[PDB]
Amino acid sequence: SHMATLKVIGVGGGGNNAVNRMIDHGMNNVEFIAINTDGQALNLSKAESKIQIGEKLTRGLGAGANPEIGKKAAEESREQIEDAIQGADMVFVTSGMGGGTGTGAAPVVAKIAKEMGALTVGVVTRPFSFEGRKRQTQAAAGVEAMKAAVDTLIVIPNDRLLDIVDKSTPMMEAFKEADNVLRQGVQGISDLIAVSGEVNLDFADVKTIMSNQGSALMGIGVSSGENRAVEAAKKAISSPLLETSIVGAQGVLMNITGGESLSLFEAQEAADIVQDAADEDVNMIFGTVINPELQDEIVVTVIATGF
Ligand SMILES: Nc1nc2c(ncn2[C@@H]2O[C@H](COP(=O)(O)OP(=O)(O)O)[C@@H](O)[C@H]2O)c(=O)[nH]1
Numbered sequence: 622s623h624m625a626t627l628k629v630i631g632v633g634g635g636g637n638n639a640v641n642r643m644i645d646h647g648m649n650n651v652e653f654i655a656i657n658t659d660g661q662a663l664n665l666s667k668a669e670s671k672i673q674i675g676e677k678l679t680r681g682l683g684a685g686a687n688p689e690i691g692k693k694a695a696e697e698s699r700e701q702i703e704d705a706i707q708g709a710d711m712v713f714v715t716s717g718m719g720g721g722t723g724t725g726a727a728p729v730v731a732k733i734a735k736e737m738g739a740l741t742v743g744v745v746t747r748p749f750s751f752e753g754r755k756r757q758t759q760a761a762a763g764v765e766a767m768k769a770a771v772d773t774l775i776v777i778p779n780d781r782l783l784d785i786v787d788k789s790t791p792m793m794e795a796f797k798e799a800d801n802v803l804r805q806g807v808q809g810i811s812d813l814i815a816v817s818g819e820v821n822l823d824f825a826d827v828k829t830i831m832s833n834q835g836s837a838l839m840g841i842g843v844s845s846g847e848n849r850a851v852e853a854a855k856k857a858i859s860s861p862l863l864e865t866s867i868v869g870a871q872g873v874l875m876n877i878t879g880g881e882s883l884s885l886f887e888a889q890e891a892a893d894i895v896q897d898a899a900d901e902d903v904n905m906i907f908g909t910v911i912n913p914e915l916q917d918e919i920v921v922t923v924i925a926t927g928f
Pocket residue numbers: 632633634635636638639683684685686716717718719720721722723724746747748749752756779796799
């Protein structure tokens with residue numbers, strides 16, 4: 622009856638890098654919008670919809686690390702941004718904080734989406750410490766601005782990438798790991814919408830957990846064999862890349878997908894992992910999907926808010 626329209630918007634260089642790598646990976650039923658001052662980068666964007674902002678301000682260059690330029694470029698193009706969003710039920714705005722375009726334009730894009738009624742989720746990075754204190758300070762101002770403009774915000778400090786690489790891991794492979802946070806969040810919501818689960822969750826449940834909330838965690842875990850439900854739930858709530866951990870979550874959207882062997886006992890085990898890890902009484906919105914194609918595998922999806 623209702624088919625929710627999801628859009629992913631990349632703002633500035635890193636945000637548009639994320640959009641390009643996600644399109645390359647493959648994502649059906651999601652629409653991508655690339656927003657940048659940098660016309661050279663936009664010409665290389667794989668996104669179906671591209672918006673060059675601030676051409677008269679920047680003559681087609683980036684914003685040169687000045688967030689005021691990004692902010693003015695986005696406001697001067699509000700109509701174009703609204704046209705690109707129109708029809709969206711949910712908008713993911715992804716951006717690297719600390720530069721000129723993302724820091725200044727991403728909060729404007731999010732505000733536009735929110736006042737179009739879209740469930741608006743920000744997924745943003747903080748700069749590496751080696752990029753210096755000014756960049757960290759600019760980024761912090763952009764994070765605060767994003768928080769004021771979105772329904773829910775996921776922050777990925779780039780410094781956490783240094784916790785998951787070895788000395789040889791290519792930087793592009795590290796960036797793909799940060800990409801997965803957004804990509805797997807979008808996909809879990811897309812999967813939730815597409816299927817009528819045995820205990821069904823739908824977009825209105827996503828809205829209940831994410832609307833007007835603040836910090837969020839999105840995660841997915843997949844496991845097989847003995848103890849699969851516990852292991853998958855631990856993976857879903859344990860990202861080394863997130864600023865916001867599960868601890869102190871008070872609302873959780875949790876979906877469990879399994880084959881016909883999905884037992885009541887292990888659904889409780891998985892739910893209990895999330896309750897006990899949050900260390901709070903969690904308002905859980907719980908769903909289950911029996912996908913008989915799956916054999917021994919189980920999938921746990923978690924969206925946590927209420928901090
Ligand atoms: N994780 C990740 N971070 C990025 C990427 N590109 C840029 N960044 C970070 O994002 C910050 C802003 O850079 P960028 O998006 O290119 O600046 P902007 O285009 O002016 O908004 C940089 O300081 C880096 O910390 C990326 O592809 N992945």
